[PDB]
Design a protein around this ligand. Structure first.
Ligand SMILES: CC[C@H](C)[C@H]1O[C@]2(CC[C@@H]1C)C[C@@H]1C[C@@H](C/C=C(\C)[C@@H](O[C@H]3C[C@H](OC)[C@@H](O[C@H]4C[C@H](OC)[C@@H](O)[C@H](C)O4)[C@H](C)O3)[C@@H](C)/C=C/C=C3\CO[C@@H]4[C@H](O)C(C)=C[C@@H](C(=O)O1)[C@]34O)O2
Ligand SMILES: CCCCCCCCCCCCO[C@@H]1O[C@H](CO)[C@@H](O[C@H]2O[C@H](CO)[C@@H](O)[C@H](O)[C@H]2O)[C@H](O)[C@H]1O
Ligand SMILES: *[C@@H]1O[C@H](CO)[C@@H](O)[C@H](O)[C@H]1NC(C)=O
Ligand SMILES: CCCCCCCCCCC
Ligand SMILES: CCCCCCCC
Lengths: 79, 87
């Protein structure tokens, strides 16, 4: 939608950095699902509680990292 | 070149195009510019997002074969999206 009202250029716009970043956060979410679900069905309980651990870490890591991103992004382009 | 963002004027030439018509032979000049299409846009708006889309279709190879609803949802979504992007 946004990229359609723009002329094709030769440089990377600050808008691209922000779209591409959010895109990654959601892509890594999917990856996380796969990782969690894959080591979850593994027979041993060794992997199973690791699976649980991955979620716990994600529930906090993702927000924290996205917040860190925002801070870096806005200081860099909001100037 | 600064008012021409989408392309890059790589080369120019100056030639003649004198032609013989039914009403006579008319002298003619021809200036030619060569336009090279900027790639950055198509990299970011076509190739990158398609690889990212194809790569997503792969993360379903790591879901247990029992949970096929997850696999289909991935493969089908990425496929549909691929269509839209092409359109
Ligand atoms: C990285 C691609 C894979 C598939 C990943 O994609 C995702 C997640 C999944 C994969 C891991 C999603 C993807 C973004 C990337 C993450 C990319 C960034 C955060 C930024 O870019 C990186 C890499 C980039 O170099 C590829 C690099 O530029 C260098 C090298 C280049 O030359 C090789 C050169 O030109 C340049 C001058 O300097 C850059 C500095 O930094 C960010 C710029 C990317 C934005 C991407 C997009 C913005 O809108 C696009 C489109 O409207 C859409 C719908 C999808 C987006 C997307 O496709 O989102 C999109 O295309 O991750
Ligand atoms: C803010 C709301 C967060 O909510 C909270 O999240 C954490 C994990 O992230 C959960 O805690 C989770 O990990 C612990 C680890 O020992 C488990 O015992 C618990 O079964 C599980 O639910 C809490 O049950 C939930 O109350
Ligand atoms: C520009 O330069 C190259 C090399 O001289 C040549 O092959 C090409 O025909 C030129 N283009 C124009 C339109 O003059
Ligand atoms: C010990 C784990 C605590 C996780 C807290 C997650 C909070 C996420 C809020 C996102 C807005
Ligand atoms: C600029 C890309 C940031 C991606 C962070 C992903 C964290 C899960």
């Amino acid at each position: 939608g946004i990229n359609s009202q723009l002329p094709p250029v030769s440089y990377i716009k600050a808008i691209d950095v922000w779209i591409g970043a959010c895109m990654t956060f959601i892509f890594c979410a999917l990856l996380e699902f796969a990782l969690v679900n894959h080591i979850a069905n593994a027979g041993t309980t060794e992997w199973n509680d690791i699976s649980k651990r991955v979620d716990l870490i994600s529930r906090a890591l993702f927000p924290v990292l996205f917040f860190v991103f925002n801070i870096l992004y806005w200081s860099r382009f909001g100037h | 070149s600064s008012s021409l963002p989408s392309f890059q004027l790589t080369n120019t030439s100056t030639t003649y195009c004198t032609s013989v018509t039914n009403t006579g032979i008319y002298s003619c000049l021809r200036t030619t510019i060569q336009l090279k299409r900027e790639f950055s846009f198509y990299l970011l708006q076509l190739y990158i997002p398609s690889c990212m889309l194809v790569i997503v279709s792969w993360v379903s190879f790591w879901f247990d074969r029992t949970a096929i609803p997850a696999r289909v949802t991935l493969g089908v979504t990425t496929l549909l999206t691929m269509t839209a992007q092409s359109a």
